[PDB]
Symmetry: C2
Subunit: 292 residues, 2 copies
């Protein structure tokens, strides 16, 4: 029920660092108008690591407030402390969010078993749908398909955001879980193929700068237009690459500022897109029709 083009929404800051309510509103109208199937506020792209417990609910509120029930609002709520996690989920719930995206405990290095008991605890604790998040390249830990399987049998856990970008890991998670457990792509470049395999959506980053095209990609890939889907993806590959030319979301913000959607403001330890990367990404945005 939550599927398709989903935006891992960035979170606007002004040159000084403060949040820009003016810009969030626009981003939301942009994706609203352009047809994104769901918004994911306060995720990795939303710079979830550098927001106040207070800044994180405020953000969810004013997004939920504006969507106004039209499409699903998903809140990033994962901590690597289980208690810090229930805290954030509780907050996102009491924010009006519709579901939560929870990333596996980072830095921490949990065992598969610890990962399991971590997630059930949270699913038990906060009555709100929850979507797992596997992304080893950032976590340094990894939720084996064997564990996702166990998890899928828990009440309010209804999906996973699989971000290895490994298409066999997908061909496996999908094969292990029921059809009512949804597997999402967390890697834009290969999100088209994962959907062709039985995937139901792409929590995307590209979608920040080209939301319409991403709906088109997701729709065709979900019907079965394998030739149509890959043709769209092929058309967007230069962009998927460019959006990750330096750690995310550094690239996608540069993009959005260039489209005049967000100010030039990104919190440390993240920096603004270094000068080298500007013309390879400005050209991509052009080569792919989001910039003139």
């Amino acid at each position: 029920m939550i599927a398709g083009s989903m935006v891992a929404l960035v979170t606007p800051f002004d040159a000084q660092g403060r949040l820009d309510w003016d810009s969030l509103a626009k981003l939301v109208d942009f994706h609203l108008q352009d047809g994104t199937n769901a918004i994911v506020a306060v995720g990795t792209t939303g710079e979830s690591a550098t927001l106040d417990v207070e800044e994180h609910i405020q953000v969810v509120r004013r997004v939920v407030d504006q969507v106004k029930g039209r499409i699903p609002v998903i809140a990033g709520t994962g901590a690597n402390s289980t208690r810090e996690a229930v805290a954030l989920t509780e907050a996102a719930k009491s924010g009006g969010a519709d579901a939560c995206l929870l990333v596996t405990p980072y830095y921490n290095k949990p065992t598969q078993e610890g990962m399991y008991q971590h997630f059930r605890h949270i699913a038990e604790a906060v009555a709100i749908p929850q979507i797992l998040y596997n992304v080893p390249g950032r976590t340094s830990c990894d939720m084996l398909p064997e564990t996702v399987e166990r998890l899928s049998k828990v009440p309010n856990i209804i999906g996973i955001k699989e971000a290895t970008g490994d298409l066999q890991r997908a061909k496996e998670v999908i094969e292990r879980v029921g059809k009512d457990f949804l597997v999402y792509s967390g890697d834009d470049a290969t999100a088209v193929e994962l959907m062709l395999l039985g995937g139901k959506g792409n929590i995307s980053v590209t979608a920040n700068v080209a939301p319409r095209a991403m709906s088109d990609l997701c729709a065709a890939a979900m019907r079965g237009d394998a030739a149509a889907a890959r043709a769209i993806n092929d058309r967007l590959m230069p962009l998927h690459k460019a959006l990750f030319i330096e750690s995310n979301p550094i690239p996608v913000k540069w993009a959005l500022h260039e489209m005049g959607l967000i100010p030039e403001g990104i919190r440390l330890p993240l920096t603004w897109l270094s000068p080298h990367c500007h013309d390879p990404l400005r050209q991509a945005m052009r080569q792919t029709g989001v910039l003139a």
Copy 2:
């Protein structure tokens, strides 16, 4: 001064989840007696991830207090946010810490330029020696040697904890940094050689169960008495591997509980040592003379 065998202290929890101040006192006493040179309170081994902010200071203070200043107290205060990094550090400085160990930002994966800006700021906001801690095995982020040279030259940044376990790196670093900057070991397996190369200490995990042997080992090494340094390191090798038979600090906690020093107690997501790994570890503590 800060050098030699430094224990990365575990922070004990009773069966229900609370902090056992008795046991923390016992551990301190234990290291204080068997020859430890310093204490890294509330670090990765200290299970910082799952600690409260209040719980954080409540210990660094308690240990300092109990140390009577006989030995330096290094507090972990690294966060993946520049802001709480500065906050946590302001705390350790108030609690009475003598210097801080800060991990390179985990999960958000900075730019090298970002790391530099990260640490530099923190160094100008809190007057207190700082020790850089590098560990891509956990942070999905590697602070190159260029970035290290660059930071070594910042006023109250006095060293680095190097975990890569790659000796060639901690040979390029010693080369690049001054005579006054201090390189410490992160990897317990390779610490000895890092010191033979010009290292100044080992921020040890094994030292938890075997502080006295580690003191010795560091002495031999920093004297250039490789002959002896290695003799000890071999009789500890069984230990060095066993204590990571499962993510730190899950194993070392268990061993500590086995010696009668700390209660069974570890916070979620971390779990208790899987039965699986009980014979393997227990045997090592025997091979090693910490248990008969």
